[PDB]
Write a protein that binds this ligand. Structure first.
Ligand SMILES: O=C(O)c1ccccc1O
Ligand SMILES: [Cl-]
Ligand SMILES: [Cl-]
Ligand code: NA
Ligand code: NA
Lengths: 148, 148
């Protein structure tokens, strides 16, 4: 068994501590808007797409979740009038998710607070050099994990 | 509003993607042992404490969660005979979470596999320089988040 060295262990535990604490903190900061981070991430992905809409299978890939889990989540967001589903007449490759105007306005309301939170708890705490170096180091990890 | 620059946004999204994918993968690798990552984190904290026990209030602080959330998790682990709650005779009254013999054996069985997983999905994918850098860059973010 190759136990972690002191240097490896420290890096691993710092990563894990930041991951856990940051996820909690960002969720906490969205709570007053009645949104989960999962909700917010869908709003962002849709708003950055042409026509504010995406094929469900492409949205599933972008949010790294199963067809069935995304479907449940979209039903929840539909019930909150944030998104709607649309049929495709021309093929059988599935439904589109589309942002509603209420979804758009919700995004526009929350985004400034979310960006301020991301900055105060993370981005503004990193030197530009460390940000770049972190990104170059972590990109291949994302790639490995996406493949896995 | 100071919107994220392109460089900041790319880095931020890579951090999010890695945090999410890595948590999912490590949870998946623990599944054959019947353990969640929350379970495992408590096993680790207890096994690294003197006497393989910790005061519940210290354990809440160490895992950065509320008294009520920890309590629900400990109940689950107690039902699984991994930990016991005990008002241990002590000079300072207080409730302890105590690793059971089954907890300790479970830890000894699972730890080698978990370390192999942490290596294959993360640690063995990082150059020594990026490991040092991760640690130096992220420590102040962990500090900030703990202070919240
Ligand atoms: O999953 C881990 O390896 C770990 C390490 C330190 C503290 C809590 C944890 O879950
Ligand atoms: Cl558009
Ligand atoms: Cl000990
Ligand atoms: Na758009
Ligand atoms: Na110990």
């Amino acid at each position: 068994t190759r136990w972690l060295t002191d240097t490896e262990q420290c890096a691993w535990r710092t990563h894990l501590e930041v991951n856990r604490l940051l996820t909690h903190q960002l969720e906490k900061d969205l709570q007053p808007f009645g949104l989960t981070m999962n909700d917010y991430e869908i709003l962002v992905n849709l708003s950055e797409s042409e026509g504010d809409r995406m094929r469900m299978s492409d949205l599933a890939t972008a949010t790294m979740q199963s067809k069935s889990r995304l479907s449940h989540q979209i039903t929840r967001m539909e019930n909150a009038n944030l998104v709607r589903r649309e049929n495709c007449e021309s093929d059988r490759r599935g439904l589109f998710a589309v942002l509603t105007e209420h979804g758009l306005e919700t995004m526009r309301k929350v985004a400034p607070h979310h960006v301020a939170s991301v900055r105060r708890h993370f981005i503004d705490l990193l030197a530009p050099e460390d940000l770049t170096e972190l990104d170059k180091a972590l990109k291949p990890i994302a790639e490995h994990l996406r493949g896995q």
